[PDB]
């Protein structure tokens, strides 16, 4: 075991799911989050999950609420990038911009010492097959 705590995380592998049937789920895109860590708050070393941009939005709301409960009225969570949309949500432009933005955002959030030690939502967002 590594003597020091560590958390590696990346958001990549964006995928737009094309419907094949007239009754299949509506077209949508999600991103893969890959994380490796030895933090005591986590339950396994490697986690690989997929998340829609809306999952990140829900996560931010949940995280901000948990932080206030953890009594950290000064900790601030950055804006989620790529919220505004003036281009087709399924264009490579938008998806790549979201991928890059989400990657940077996730490393910033998951990299915060206080969230690493006391945030339960952070762990669930990274580990659960389905966030909800």
Curated annotation (Swiss-Prot):
Disruption phenotype: Abnormal retrograde transport to the Golgi apparatus with proteins missorted to the vacuole. Sensitive to neomycin and trifluoperazine; sensitivity is suppressed by knockout of ANY1. Signal peptide: none annotated. One of its GO terms (cellular component) is Golgi membrane. A 1,2-diacyl-sn-glycero-3-phospho-(1D-myo-inositol-3-phosphate) binds at residues 52, 54, 83, 98. Residues 9-132 form the PX domain. Keywords: Cytoplasm, Golgi apparatus, Lipid-binding, Membrane, Protein transport, Transport. One of its GO terms (molecular function) is phosphatidylinositol-3-phosphate binding. Belongs to the sorting nexin family. Required for retention of late Golgi membrane proteins. Component of the retrieval machinery that functions by direct interaction with the cytosolic tails of certain TGN membrane proteins during the sorting/budding process at the prevacuolar compartment. Binds phosphatidylinositol 3-phosphate (PtdIns(P3)). This is Sorting nexin-3.
């Amino acid at each position: 075991a590594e003597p020091e705590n560590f958390l590696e995380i990346e958001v990549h592998n964006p995928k737009t799911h094309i419907p094949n049937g007239m009754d299949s789920k509506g077209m949508f895109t999600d991103y893969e989050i890959i994380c490796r860590t030895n933090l005591p708050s986590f339950h396994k070393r490697v986690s690989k999950v997929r998340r829609r941009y809306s999952d990140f939005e829900f996560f931010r709301k949940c995280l901000i609420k948990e932080i206030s409960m953890l009594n950290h009225p000064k900790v601030m969570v950055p804006h989620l990038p790529g919220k505004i949309l003036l281009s087709n949500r399924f264009s490579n432009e938008v998806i790549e911009e979201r991928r890059q933005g989400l990657n940077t955002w996730m490393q910033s959030v998951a990299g915060h010492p206080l969230l690493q030690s006391g945030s339960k939502v952070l762990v669930r967002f990274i580990e659960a097959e389905k966030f909800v």
